Amino acid sequence: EESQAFQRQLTALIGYDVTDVSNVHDDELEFTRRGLVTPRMAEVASRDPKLYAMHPWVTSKPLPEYLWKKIANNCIFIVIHRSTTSQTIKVSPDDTPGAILQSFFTDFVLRVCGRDEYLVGETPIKNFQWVRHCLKNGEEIHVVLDTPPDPALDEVRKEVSLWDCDRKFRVKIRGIDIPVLDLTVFVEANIQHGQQVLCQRRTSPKPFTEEVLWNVWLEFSIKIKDLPKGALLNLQIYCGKVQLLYYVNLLLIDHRFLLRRGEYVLHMWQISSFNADKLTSATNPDKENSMSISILLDPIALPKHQEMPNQLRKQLEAIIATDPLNPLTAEDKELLWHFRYESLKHPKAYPKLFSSVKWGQQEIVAKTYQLLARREVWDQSALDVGLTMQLLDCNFSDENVRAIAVQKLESLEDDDVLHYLLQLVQAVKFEPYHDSALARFLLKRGLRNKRIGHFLFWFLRSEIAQSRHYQQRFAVILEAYLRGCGTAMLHDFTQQVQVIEMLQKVTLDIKSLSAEDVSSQVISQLKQKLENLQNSQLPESFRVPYDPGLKAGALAIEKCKVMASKKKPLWLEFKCADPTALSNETIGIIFKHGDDLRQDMLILQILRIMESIWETESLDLCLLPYGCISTGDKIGMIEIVKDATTIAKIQQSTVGNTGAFKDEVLNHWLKEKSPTEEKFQAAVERFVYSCAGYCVATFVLGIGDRHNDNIMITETGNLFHIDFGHIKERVPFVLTPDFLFVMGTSGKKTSPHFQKFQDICVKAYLALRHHTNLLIILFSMMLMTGMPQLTSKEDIEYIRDALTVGKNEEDAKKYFLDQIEVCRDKGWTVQFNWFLHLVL
Ligand SMILES: COc1ncc(Nc2ncc([C@@H](C)N3CCN(S(C)(=O)=O)CC3)cc2-c2nc(C)nc(N)n2)cc1F
């Protein structure tokens, strides 16, 4: 009974009932649940309860040069508090927490004031992110003396060979049936491995009535022994002049290596090119409205495995050197395959090589597995995330290839997993089976670390709530996570979900009262409902989903309001529930219903990756990739950046509601907000840096052409773009006269700052180009897994151009500087055209 009481709880947290079997035709999901018990238990049993409880967040990356020149001679100050009054201590960057706490005593723990963050463990204090964060923002390091939190609070509650068959594969299409609906229609059946169609066959076209039967056998040209694991039977329905209307898939070799035998009635998905959704094995849960198809397959199990010319070498290195979106010809494929063993010596050749394997040919695949047996150089090579990500995309449906990718991820430190976690979670969509090396890796790295675990929960939950194609798989994975994270995390997750459920309701009802124009009489209505839920049943405190170290407390009803938008998001502000906080600042969260926030998360995360890339080359570009977390179906939270205003408003306040935009206004605003000329120029510099990073970052992603109401700036000079969910003469990015004036330029001039801006942009751009392959992959995956409305080849090939693939550096500078100049030329014309468009 209580075990079922625990399952009800799990289900509430996941947002999907995992025990259900109403939408399966096999036991793969249930088999995967039993399969993940072991790796879960293993990781739960092997994790240090102490370090797990305090989750020290640390890095082994070198302290960047920009954070070095902010330390006054190998010394940092660490203010230690107790009851109220605060003693200060001098420390060197290399002092371990215990060493600093030993210095003080002439057992307790150092906790960061206001946060559930801890400076504990065998690493120097220059190696904690909270310290580097305090350094970057020119801030002081305040910590309390505290008891370690009890590990009892994290306690988890204990608990015929296929290769002897030369028969061609065939499938019987009995017919299709739609419940509701004059043209004709046919069924197309594809044997696929990844994006490759191995063999294709159609039925003959019949009239599209609410029931169409065929009773036809489609013999394929492929032999049953030649079926590779992860082969999908992809059934599609066309009509006409031709158009695809429905699709469904079925793994031909199941999870227990058995060939698929018997009667199936598969409920299909509708269409609204390369969408991750097209690859799913999930059938449509909506039995009542959806099309279905009926088929027949006729105990076969699949067995398991055990000096060139100059011209050709060059030709092979030319191929190996190309980008991931450069299509390989048959000549190139045949070359790579013929020179198999020479290509294996180059890690960079792996994606291309494994794309040259004829996967519908049992002996070739065998030789490929032989080849994978001899992977000494790969195993030895340093971790290349870009290369590793390529092997986890839609082009690779073979487990053994994919496993060598995950093999390399094992060596990622917890800092790096957090950088790539979102996209690793999305790559699960390209896995043929519910149980995968990648799925388990995410499981153990999550269970090993509360911060990875926190974000894994939300990322998974976000997909479970707004994707029917993959919710089943992600629900199995998240169930496995929650069954080992511990009772404390379970309580946190419960609190967080409760709060966001309470806020959703208040949002839906507020949206209903308004005419889409936001009256202040409605802002009284909002304040009423917020007060109503404050006493009961809102919880005393909750972790901020996008910043888990922070606990939000009581609402500041006074400061909450309904924002002037057509989605009417809630601007909310909370007090911090932690009294040891030594600030008054509220915690600002925008709560929005109406849009899928996943796209936003993806761009923001790519921005974080771009930052770290730049850190490798000691460049800081002061981007503000603010917190943004999808929390359920078309709902989520966004962090409110403090002391921030839009560029639009700075114009509107001086100039008025008119497009008569003025060059001087921003610099004036910055001058007025800067109290001192030293703080001013620092703000101006921050702006030159910020502006350069957003110019480069948005060019590469093709999101630089924006209305300046979607660009903001802080009172300390920090420019940042907002609201990426959305997405004539154009512009590569936003570099307007107001920005140029702040730098000391107008019309056709240059300055001390402007040349430095051009300097930073060029070095920023080139630095990204040193990771072309990585960025191309994240961009392809982003499109394929997060943006259904923008997934053609030509959409993906934007980034090839943007990154000037194949060109030398010195030319690529010339390319970027032209873009800077294509802005100069246009001044206000596009911003002005944005005013005409959006305001009217
Ligand atoms: C993905 O959806 C969103 N993404 C980002 C934001 N953030 C912001 N959106 C709009 C604004 C400006 C234009 N806003 C207009 C309305 N007024 S009002 C009179 O309704 O209160 C407030 C200012 C600002 C933000 C924003 N975003 C962040 C991250 N920080 C700050 N400070 N602001 C809001 C979203 F709904």
PDB file of C-alpha atoms in Angstrom, residues 57-158:
ATOM      1  CA  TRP A  57      30.557  22.827  -7.015  1.00  0.00           C
ATOM      2  CA  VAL A  58      34.081  22.979  -8.353  1.00  0.00           C
ATOM      3  CA  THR A  59      36.294  23.052 -11.457  1.00  0.00           C
ATOM      4  CA  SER A  60      39.743  21.785 -12.432  1.00  0.00           C
ATOM      5  CA  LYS A  61      40.080  24.289 -15.237  1.00  0.00           C
ATOM      6  CA  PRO A  62      42.852  26.849 -14.851  1.00  0.00           C
ATOM      7  CA  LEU A  63      41.849  30.154 -13.309  1.00  0.00           C
ATOM      8  CA  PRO A  64      41.510  32.383 -16.376  1.00  0.00           C
ATOM      9  CA  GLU A  65      43.896  35.320 -16.920  1.00  0.00           C
ATOM     10  CA  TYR A  66      41.027  37.800 -16.474  1.00  0.00           C
ATOM     11  CA  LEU A  67      40.336  36.499 -12.944  1.00  0.00           C
ATOM     12  CA  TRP A  68      44.079  36.449 -12.108  1.00  0.00           C
ATOM     13  CA  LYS A  69      44.633  40.152 -12.572  1.00  0.00           C
ATOM     14  CA  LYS A  70      41.888  40.789 -10.000  1.00  0.00           C
ATOM     15  CA  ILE A  71      43.852  39.144  -7.149  1.00  0.00           C
ATOM     16  CA  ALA A  72      46.065  41.550  -5.201  1.00  0.00           C
ATOM     17  CA  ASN A  73      49.252  39.474  -4.863  1.00  0.00           C
ATOM     18  CA  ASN A  74      48.114  35.880  -4.186  1.00  0.00           C
ATOM     19  CA  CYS A  75      45.554  37.033  -1.604  1.00  0.00           C
ATOM     20  CA  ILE A  76      41.756  36.896  -1.371  1.00  0.00           C
ATOM     21  CA  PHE A  77      39.526  37.971   1.507  1.00  0.00           C
ATOM     22  CA  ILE A  78      36.948  35.579   2.949  1.00  0.00           C
ATOM     23  CA  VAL A  79      34.615  37.132   5.498  1.00  0.00           C
ATOM     24  CA  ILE A  80      33.501  34.550   8.081  1.00  0.00           C
ATOM     25  CA  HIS A  81      30.281  35.019  10.065  1.00  0.00           C
ATOM     26  CA  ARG A  82      28.735  33.393  13.126  1.00  0.00           C
ATOM     27  CA  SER A  83      25.889  34.842  15.246  1.00  0.00           C
ATOM     28  CA  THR A  84      25.918  38.295  13.614  1.00  0.00           C
ATOM     29  CA  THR A  85      29.345  40.029  13.663  1.00  0.00           C
ATOM     30  CA  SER A  86      31.815  39.028  10.958  1.00  0.00           C
ATOM     31  CA  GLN A  87      35.540  38.302  11.280  1.00  0.00           C
ATOM     32  CA  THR A  88      37.619  38.477   8.073  1.00  0.00           C
ATOM     33  CA  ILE A  89      40.497  36.222   6.970  1.00  0.00           C
ATOM     34  CA  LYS A  90      43.259  36.601   4.367  1.00  0.00           C
ATOM     35  CA  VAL A  91      43.909  33.488   2.229  1.00  0.00           C
ATOM     36  CA  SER A  92      45.950  32.385  -0.808  1.00  0.00           C
ATOM     37  CA  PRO A  93      44.243  30.914  -3.927  1.00  0.00           C
ATOM     38  CA  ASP A  94      45.649  27.454  -3.179  1.00  0.00           C
ATOM     39  CA  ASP A  95      44.285  27.050   0.368  1.00  0.00           C
ATOM     40  CA  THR A  96      41.985  24.011   0.769  1.00  0.00           C
ATOM     41  CA  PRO A  97      38.753  24.637   2.780  1.00  0.00           C
ATOM     42  CA  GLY A  98      40.182  22.757   5.790  1.00  0.00           C
ATOM     43  CA  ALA A  99      43.410  24.777   5.574  1.00  0.00           C
ATOM     44  CA  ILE A 100      41.407  28.018   5.609  1.00  0.00           C
ATOM     45  CA  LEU A 101      39.227  26.708   8.452  1.00  0.00           C
ATOM     46  CA  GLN A 102      42.435  25.678  10.296  1.00  0.00           C
ATOM     47  CA  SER A 103      43.810  29.220   9.926  1.00  0.00           C
ATOM     48  CA  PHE A 104      40.585  30.442  11.601  1.00  0.00           C
ATOM     49  CA  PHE A 105      40.608  28.045  14.600  1.00  0.00           C
ATOM     50  CA  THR A 106      43.899  29.702  15.645  1.00  0.00           C
ATOM     51  CA  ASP A 107      34.377  20.211  13.101  1.00  0.00           C
ATOM     52  CA  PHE A 108      32.190  22.664  11.168  1.00  0.00           C
ATOM     53  CA  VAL A 109      31.622  23.670   7.521  1.00  0.00           C
ATOM     54  CA  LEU A 110      31.798  26.820   5.388  1.00  0.00           C
ATOM     55  CA  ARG A 111      28.454  27.638   3.766  1.00  0.00           C
ATOM     56  CA  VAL A 112      27.908  30.607   1.433  1.00  0.00           C
ATOM     57  CA  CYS A 113      25.758  33.299   3.025  1.00  0.00           C
ATOM     58  CA  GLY A 114      22.171  33.141   1.676  1.00  0.00           C
ATOM     59  CA  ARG A 115      22.659  29.944  -0.368  1.00  0.00           C
ATOM     60  CA  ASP A 116      22.761  26.179  -0.092  1.00  0.00           C
ATOM     61  CA  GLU A 117      26.314  26.162  -1.436  1.00  0.00           C
ATOM     62  CA  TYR A 118      29.350  24.799   0.437  1.00  0.00           C
ATOM     63  CA  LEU A 119      33.102  25.404   0.269  1.00  0.00           C
ATOM     64  CA  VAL A 120      34.146  21.848   1.255  1.00  0.00           C
ATOM     65  CA  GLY A 121      36.510  19.135  -0.023  1.00  0.00           C
ATOM     66  CA  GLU A 122      40.006  18.527  -1.387  1.00  0.00           C
ATOM     67  CA  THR A 123      40.280  21.352  -3.910  1.00  0.00           C
ATOM     68  CA  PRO A 124      41.800  24.849  -3.666  1.00  0.00           C
ATOM     69  CA  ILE A 125      39.452  27.801  -3.147  1.00  0.00           C
ATOM     70  CA  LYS A 126      40.395  29.304  -6.517  1.00  0.00           C
ATOM     71  CA  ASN A 127      38.741  26.127  -7.905  1.00  0.00           C
ATOM     72  CA  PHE A 128      35.178  26.783  -6.573  1.00  0.00           C
ATOM     73  CA  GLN A 129      32.754  28.443  -9.025  1.00  0.00           C
ATOM     74  CA  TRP A 130      31.245  30.646  -6.279  1.00  0.00           C
ATOM     75  CA  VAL A 131      34.686  32.122  -5.687  1.00  0.00           C
ATOM     76  CA  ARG A 132      35.350  32.760  -9.380  1.00  0.00           C
ATOM     77  CA  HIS A 133      31.870  34.274  -9.580  1.00  0.00           C
ATOM     78  CA  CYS A 134      32.673  36.602  -6.693  1.00  0.00           C
ATOM     79  CA  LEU A 135      35.963  37.534  -8.384  1.00  0.00           C
ATOM     80  CA  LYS A 136      34.383  38.146 -11.787  1.00  0.00           C
ATOM     81  CA  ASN A 137      31.725  40.513 -10.410  1.00  0.00           C
ATOM     82  CA  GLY A 138      34.272  42.259  -8.135  1.00  0.00           C
ATOM     83  CA  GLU A 139      32.531  40.980  -5.019  1.00  0.00           C
ATOM     84  CA  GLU A 140      33.469  39.848  -1.513  1.00  0.00           C
ATOM     85  CA  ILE A 141      33.269  36.205  -0.362  1.00  0.00           C
ATOM     86  CA  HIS A 142      30.897  35.901   2.609  1.00  0.00           C
ATOM     87  CA  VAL A 143      30.518  32.540   4.311  1.00  0.00           C
ATOM     88  CA  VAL A 144      28.915  31.315   7.579  1.00  0.00           C
ATOM     89  CA  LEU A 145      30.259  28.660   9.966  1.00  0.00           C
ATOM     90  CA  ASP A 146      27.803  25.747   9.997  1.00  0.00           C
ATOM     91  CA  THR A 147      27.191  22.080  10.834  1.00  0.00           C
ATOM     92  CA  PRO A 148      27.415  19.755   7.862  1.00  0.00           C
ATOM     93  CA  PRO A 149      23.924  18.734   6.743  1.00  0.00           C
ATOM     94  CA  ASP A 150      22.999  15.216   7.878  1.00  0.00           C
ATOM     95  CA  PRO A 151      23.347  12.451   5.211  1.00  0.00           C
ATOM     96  CA  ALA A 152      20.343  10.688   6.815  1.00  0.00           C
ATOM     97  CA  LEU A 153      18.253  13.309   4.954  1.00  0.00           C
ATOM     98  CA  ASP A 154      19.506  11.917   1.598  1.00  0.00           C
ATOM     99  CA  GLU A 155      18.857   8.314   2.513  1.00  0.00           C
ATOM    100  CA  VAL A 156      17.182   6.302  -0.231  1.00  0.00           C
ATOM    101  CA  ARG A 157      14.453   3.798   0.626  1.00  0.00           C
ATOM    102  CA  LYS A 158      15.809   0.271  -0.026  1.00  0.00           C
TER     103      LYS A 158
END
